[PDB]
Design a protein around this ligand. Sequence first.
Ligand SMILES: CN(C)C(=O)c1ccc2nccnc2c1
Length: 115
Amino acid sequence: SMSVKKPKRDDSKDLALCSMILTEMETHEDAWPFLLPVNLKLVPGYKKVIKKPMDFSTIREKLSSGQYPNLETFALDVRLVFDNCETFNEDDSDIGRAGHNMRKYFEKKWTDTFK
Ligand SMILES: CN(C)C(=O)c1ccc2nccnc2c1
C-alpha cells in the first residue's frame, strides 16, 4: 500500500528473455501455422469468429516496439495465439495438434525461465 512495498523482483532482463523464448517458438518446426497473421480475406469464418487474431510476427513486432508493459502481457498474447487456434481448429488436425504442442513447449520455457 502507500510507502509499503514487497522486495523489487529484478525485471531488467525480461525483455531480452521474452525475445529469446519468442525465437525459440519461431524456430520450432510446428510454428508454421502461427508465423503470420491468418489471412482474413481468404479464410471464411475467421474474421467474425476470432475476435482478437494474434500470431508470432505480430507479437514480435509488439515486443520490438515497447508495446508490452510487462512480462505477463507478453504471455497473454502468446496464449491468445493458442486459444484462437483451439477455437477454430479441430483437435485432431495438423494445425490443432500443432497448437497443443507449441503451447506445451511455450509453458515449459515460460516456467523454467521465470517461476
Ligand atoms: C492458426 N491457423 C493457421 C488457423 O487457425 C487456420 C485454420 C484453418 C485454415 N484453413 C484454411 C486456411 N487457413 C487456415 C488457418
